[PDB]
Each structure stands twice: as structure tokens, then as C-alpha cells.
Amino acid sequence: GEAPNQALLRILKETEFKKIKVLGSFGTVYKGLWIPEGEKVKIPVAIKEATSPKANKEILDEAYVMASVDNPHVCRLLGICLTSTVQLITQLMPFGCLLDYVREHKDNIGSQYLLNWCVQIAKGMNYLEDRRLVHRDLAARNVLVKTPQHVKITDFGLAKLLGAEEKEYHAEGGKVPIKWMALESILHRIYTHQSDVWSYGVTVWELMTFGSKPYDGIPASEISSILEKGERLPQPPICTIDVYMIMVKCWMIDADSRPKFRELIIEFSKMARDPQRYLVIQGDEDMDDVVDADEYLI
């Protein structure tokens, strides 16, 4: 069939960590510290906390996905705590979602950064493709910032692990973010790693325009029509044709004609060696026991 998922799901004791402040508000997210008992470490973590049998089902499914992945560019799940309300414990990503971050720092974001992020995101997604996993919701809002030099992919709430020989995923009805979806996805609810590539393309466009909304002001209703007309998102001001060309390819109607994440890594990597050649931006240039989750291993 396929390989045995021997990932480990760690169950955390509530006494083991303390919420410190609120981060957001669905359920409710906190920043806090996890202190495994008897190890002298403190780990900055994000804690996500009515009780719907359906809602629990979803969060548990997400936990399942996150627990099955391990990559420097994908969010790491530390554990779950099974209190009346289930809590997801993940690594704390200090600078929040990348979409809010390019918006809030446009005047300090250089080409070196933009290209590095495009590279890391492709590495993340290429890893996911290796693990035969399709994200289905890749977008700037779904990439968190550990540091300005290190981003990771998140929000596995829609991800699907393709079965043994299943190569497309056929969803059957849902509330999906249409502006980041491939055309096959919109017309036939078919999802693929290549479908992901399309969203990667739109994601890159969000970064290149410092946070602009795709098809701003265009009802999702018609988005589908537009794409068939042969239309696409416009070339961002800072983008040399080289970069834009890559986006446009991520948006070919023939999915097999789009590039592979492993190719996206090489291309954006090359451009990252000489940033200024590919992106033209104005003026380019107690806690003694705190340990980052990236250094805390089982």
C-alpha cells in the first residue's frame, strides 16, 4: 500500500504550560510557555483552545496532519492537551502571519527577503509533496514568521494525505478560498500538488505586491470566468519579467505545464544569489532556560 506513519503524537499535561497573552480570535489562540516536567527547558509555544463534536473532529484531523510532518519550513506540532476543550500546542511564531508582516514592514522589506521567502515556501511545499500531502490552502495568511529570515507553512485545516494510488483529491463541497485556487479546483473540486503550485503562484504575488488582495473587488462568483478568458493577476511593480514569468507559469491552465516545487526552489534560489537583478525595490538596503522548539527533540 504505502509506508506506515510512525509519527509520534505527544499528549501534554495542562499543568505543563501557561498561557501568557491572547493572540487571536474562531476559538482562541495564546502565546505561552511549555515546560516539560523535569527537563530544564521552557518553550515558547502557541496554544489554540462551545464544544462541537464536529469541531473536535477537525482540530484532531489537523493535529494528525501536523504530527506527521517534520521540516524546517512546515509548522511543527508539539502536542495536544485533552482538556474539556482540546488544545493544540505548536511552536510560537513571534512575527505572526506573513501576510500581515509584509504589510506592516513594506518600507524595510528588500528583495533578498522576498526571494528567500519564495525559496523557503517552495522547500516547504516540496517536502509536503514528497510526503504525498496536498495542502489545499496555501496563501500568505498561512505562512508564519519565526524570524524575518525564517518562515514556515501552516494551517493544515484543509490538507489531505493522498491515499496509496490516489493522485487527485476530489472534495465534495466546501467553503474554499477561491482567489487562490487552481482552475481545475474551482470547476471540478480536484486538488493536486500542481493545484498547490497555482496557490504558490498567487502567494508569491501577495508577497511581491506587499500584501495586496488578489482580484481586489472582484466577486469570487466571476473569478472562474476570468481565468478561462486567459486572464491573470497583473505583474507587480517590483517584478522583473523573470520573476513574473514564474508566477504566470504557476497559472497555466494545463496543470502538468506548471512548474514543480523542486524547480521553483532552484529558480528562486538562483535569483536569491543576485536579488537586485530580479526585484527592483526603492532603496533596497526569567528565561535562562528558554529553548526554541526547533532545538527541542522528543
Ligand X SMILES: Nc1ncnc2c1ncn2[C@@H]1O[C@H](COP(=O)(O)OP(=O)(O)NP(=O)(O)O)[C@@H](O)[C@H]1O
**Annotated active-site positions, please?**
137
Contacting residue, 24, 163, 234, 237, with ligand X by CB under 6 A: 24
Segment lying near ligand X (by CB under 6 A), choices 20-28, 194-202, 203-211, 254-262:
20-28
Q: Which does 295 bind (CB under 5 to 8 A by kind): ligand X, a copy of itself, none?
A: a copy of itself
Rg (CA), the chain: 20
Return d(Cα 59, Cα 82) in angstroms, integer. 12
Minimum CB–partner distance for residue 80 and ligand X (Å): 14
Return d(Cα 158, Cα 172) in angstroms, integer. 13
Alpha carbon distances (Å) from 249 to 181, 197, 205, 256: 14, 9, 12, 10
Residue closer to a copy of itself by CB (options 165, 295) is 295
> Under rule CB under 6 A, how many of the chain's residues touch ligand X?
13
Residues forming contacts to a copy of itself in the complex (CB under 8 A) are 3, 39, 41, 72, 119, 126, 262, 265-266, 269-270, 273, 288-292, 295-298
* Reduced 3-state DSSP string for 19-55: EEEEEECCCCEEEEEECCCCCCCEEEEEEECCCCHHH
Contacting residue, 62, 129, 155, 206, with ligand X by CB under 6 A: 155
Give the residue carrying C-alpha cell 493522498. 162
Cell triple for residue 205? 504575488
Segment lying near ligand X (by CB under 6 A), choices 19-27, 61-69, 205-213, 275-283:
19-27
Quick check: 92 binds ligand X (CB under 6 A)? yes
Residue closer to a copy of itself by CB (options 50, 287) is 287
54 is in an annotated binding site: no
Contacting residue, 23, 55, 178, 291, with ligand X by CB under 6 A: 23
Residue closer to ligand X by CB (options 24, 163) is 24
How crowded is the C-beta side of 271, counted as CA atoms within 13 Å? 27
Binding-residue pattern over the window 61 to 90 for ligand X, x denoting contact by CB under 6 A: -----------------------------x
Alpha carbon distances (Å) from 206 to 97, 216, 242, 290: 12, 11, 17, 34
Contacting residue, 1, 21, 26, 287, with ligand X by CB under 6 A: 26
Q: Which does 266 bind (CB under 5 to 8 A by kind): ligand X, a copy of itself, none?
A: a copy of itself
**Helix or strand or coil: residue 289?**
coil
Q: Which of 297, 292, 296 is nearest to 94 (CA)?
A: 292
24 is in an annotated binding site: yes
Quick check: 93 binds ligand X (CB under 6 A)? yes
183, 230 contact by CB (below 8 A): no
Q: Which of 62, 60, 42 is nearest to 51 (CA)?
A: 60
CA dihedral 132, 138, 141, 146 (to 10 degrees): 40
Sites of contact with ligand X (CB under 6 A): 23-24, 26, 29, 46, 48, 90, 92-93, 96-97, 144, 155
- Please enumerate, by residue number, every residue annotated as part of a binding site for ATP: 23-29, 48, 90-91, 155
